Single-chain antibody, 242 residues
Framework: DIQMTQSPSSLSASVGDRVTITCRAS??????LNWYQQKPGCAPKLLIY???SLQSGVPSRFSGSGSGTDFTLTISSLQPEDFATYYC?????????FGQGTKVEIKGSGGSGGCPPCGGSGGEVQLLESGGGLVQPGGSLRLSCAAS????????MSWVRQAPGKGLEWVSA????????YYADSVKGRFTISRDNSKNTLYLQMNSLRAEDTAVYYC????????????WGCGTLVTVSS
């Protein structure tokens, strides 16, 4: 496990400020470092991939730098819509690991709201999630992710979860053909990722669920060669308790 550490954990700033967020890796990861923005109740949004490449559609005030072990995300002029939490993620070695996140807070500002397009009610790509709900400890649950708008078998897919009020956690990934699968340490022997390329659907079958598995679960589609996830499902809540 490569440990990603962000600093600071939280941050107060004003519209127009220069904000910089640092991400440190416990070993060299070359440029396999990606940056995500997430607002409360929204799916994450890809900002930077390959350490410094700006994702199509992201304003130029966002920039990334660094290689090896130390990386920095810069917002040159903070805007009302930029108040959110920011995560780095290494795609150098499995298990893929996120930083703990940096919350950028207000302290005279106002945004239009809005979450990034997700699910089937976005555009271009669609990823319809279903299957969440309530289960008791030891039980099971199957999540589905129906894809459309792209050649499903040409893209690896991922499951990422987020416990209430905590950070993004990588769960599992599967290659485009389904021939290779990868799992976080905490879910091996209990979860199974799979895909039906004839039906264009991604699955996560879970059993022996624990209370620590309670989270919002996202399916996400990979893109390119640097392990970035450019489109996400809206999330489905899985609750494990008595």
């Amino acid at each position: 496990d490569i440990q990603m550490t962000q600093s600071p954990s939280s941050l107060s700033a004003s519209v127009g400020d220069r904000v910089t967020i640092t991400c440190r890796a416990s070993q060299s990861i070359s440029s396999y470092l990606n940056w995500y923005q997430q607002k409360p109740g929204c799916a994450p949004k890809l900002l930077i991939y390959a350490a410094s490449s700006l994702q199509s559609g992201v304003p130029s005030r966002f920039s990334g730098s660094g290689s090896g072990t130390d990386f920095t995300l810069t917002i040159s002029s903070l805007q009302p819509e930029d108040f959110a939490t920011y995560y780095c993620q290494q795609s150098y070695s499995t298990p893929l690991t996120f930083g703990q996140g940096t919350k950028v807070e207000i302290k005279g500002s106002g945004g239009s709201g809005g979450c990034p397009p997700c699910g089937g009610s976005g555009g271009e790509v669609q990823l319809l999630e279903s299957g969440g709900g309530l289960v008791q400890p030891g039980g099971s649950l199957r999540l589905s992710c129906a894809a459309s708008g792209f050649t499903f078998s040409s893209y690896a897919m991922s499951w990422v979860r987020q416990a209430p009020g905590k950070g993004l956690e990588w769960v599992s990934a599967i290659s485009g053909s389904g021939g290779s699968t990868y799992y976080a340490d905490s879910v091996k022997g209990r979860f199974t990722i799979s895909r039906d390329n004839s039906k264009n659907t991604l699955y996560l079958q879970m059993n022996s669920l624990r209370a620590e598995d309670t989270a919002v679960y996202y399916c996400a589609k990979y893109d390119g060669i640097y392990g970035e996830l450019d489109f996400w499902g809206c999330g489905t809540l899985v609750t494990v308790s008595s």
